[PDB]
Amino acid sequence: HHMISFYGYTHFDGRTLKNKYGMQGKALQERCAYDLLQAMLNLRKEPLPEKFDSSYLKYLHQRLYEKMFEWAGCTCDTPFTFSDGTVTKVPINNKIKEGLKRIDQILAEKNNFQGLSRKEFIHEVSTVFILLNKIRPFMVGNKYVQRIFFEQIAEAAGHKLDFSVVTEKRMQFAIHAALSRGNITPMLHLFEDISNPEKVGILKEFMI
Amino acid sequence: ISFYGYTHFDGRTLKNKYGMQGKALQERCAYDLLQAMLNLRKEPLPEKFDSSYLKYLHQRLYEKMFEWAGCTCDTPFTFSDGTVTKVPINNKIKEGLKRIDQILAEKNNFQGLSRKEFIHEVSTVFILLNKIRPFMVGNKYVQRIFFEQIAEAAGHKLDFSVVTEKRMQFAIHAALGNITPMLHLFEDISNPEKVGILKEFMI
Amino acid sequence: AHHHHHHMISFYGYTHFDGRTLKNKYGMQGKALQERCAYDLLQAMLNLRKEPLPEKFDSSYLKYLHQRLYEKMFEWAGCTCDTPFTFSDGTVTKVPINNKIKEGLKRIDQILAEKNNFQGLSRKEFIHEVSTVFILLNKIRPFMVGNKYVQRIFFEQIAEAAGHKLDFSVVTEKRMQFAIHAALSRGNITPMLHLFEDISNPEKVGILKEF
């Protein structure tokens, strides 16, 4: 809210994102959601990649917001220049670049988490998932691109993740647990329920 | 709803056939409404979709609850106790419904159309049917069933279950005119693949 | 019957000195407690489905469900609150005055025995039988914590054995709350009958999901 305004991603008003539509208010939210839904549809049409890295993450962020924002596949660790000459600011000590480099070597060394048991898969993904949340590569749209990212990683690893049955409060606490101490246990519990089809089915019977 | 004399002197309780009030009324109304929707599906589709069929849908849904089942609010209704309702000035309901009947007749119930053409045709009538409020209560349910059956007869399918109350409210406000949000709505709705994606984000 | 969190659970000595945290075997509090409880509860429900349905449904089986769900969570797993419970720290619980739990469970057992676990009944007869026992099982609160979940599984298994099916997923929290309050205040069981009638009807359940 104030973060997006501080680093010069909004207009002089202080809350309206600089967009390609030139829209504001509810009209902007509607137009953004429509293109975002279309982008997700085309992404599923595309086959899964052979290697998952930070570059692919930026590609996902690009495909999702290229019709809305000029800084689509760009991370906020570096100042962006709009087409009107205006520039953005960078959060001090962000550690985004060093963070993404770490994620890339892990996904390379562990062979994209392929050829693993689901129990082994959960323990490996949970660490990377938390790290990708500690650093916020993109200014806007982190939640969606991270969700799609790990959903496709899982599918390539023979496992399946269903994020539809996790509440916002559960995810917030799991992240808060190992970023405010170092308790990955709630996150482990999250992915274990999520990667378990029988448990997902039961959760759907209580999703009300 | 209170201003047009559809409730009791208390100010919040709709005049009903049950003589019930409060939470008990909401429960009883919903129960018969659910039964009514089931019975409506039991019945076959009509040959022609017009305002008369719209009133018929409204009748079947609320005939066990309200005495003004198949009645529009463009004309004063007389309850069985002598009390009368009021009519919104310059409602334009009668002329509005007459226009809808002519459109659905000339365009052959939106049949034999492409999906793109179907969206642009339904959205126009849907907005018009929202600009005017034919019934005092129960517009949302009768309009949904109305256009769902129109769509099914036109070879296309609409899933209104994945629309939030806020999105529909904005879509109506936009063209009341910007019809683009309404077009975006119906385009997502008539797209089975998009409906599935929307279901994956219903927290 | 308490309000805005339970002073009742605190008064009968089921919570810690803070006044809102249930005495648990993990020694956790707050959101951490909620997470572990939900996780263990989900695991327990999964294991309950693996085992086959019982031959007879009684109050003992009800306690069994409550045990399996909360045995990793609470020391008083399969225990009803009609009898004082002693924690492993020497502390004892109190018993709600005029609870009527013992007579209530005894009646339910007699009903389920005479009516053959509601098997061999018409759908209409099944509704009137389940609704009565459900209300009675709600009028008395056998367990201090966890009544909603154990009752749901209880009647879901009873129904499945009776050839009928109950889908509680299409019931809002407000509808159930009104239905219970209706036949507890010469009681109006009509909202309860309407609830179970919609629930045991696959066609109505399908429509409810679309609305």
Author numbering:
A (entry chain B): 11 to 190, 197 to 224
B (entry chain C): 14 to 189, 198 to 224
C (entry chain A): 6 to 190, 197 to 222
Source paper text:
Additionally, FIC domains generally contain a β-hairpin between helix α2 and helix α3 that is referred to as the “flap” and mediates docking of a target segment in extended conformation via β-strand augmentation.
The structurally required residues of the FIC signature motif (PFxx(N/S)G) are conserved, explaining the canonical fold of the FIC loop, but most other residues of the FIC signature motif are distinct. Bcl_Bep5 FIC crystals were grown from a solution of 20% w/v PEG 3350, 0.1 M sodium citrate/citric acid, pH 4.0, and 0.2 M sodium citrate tribasic.
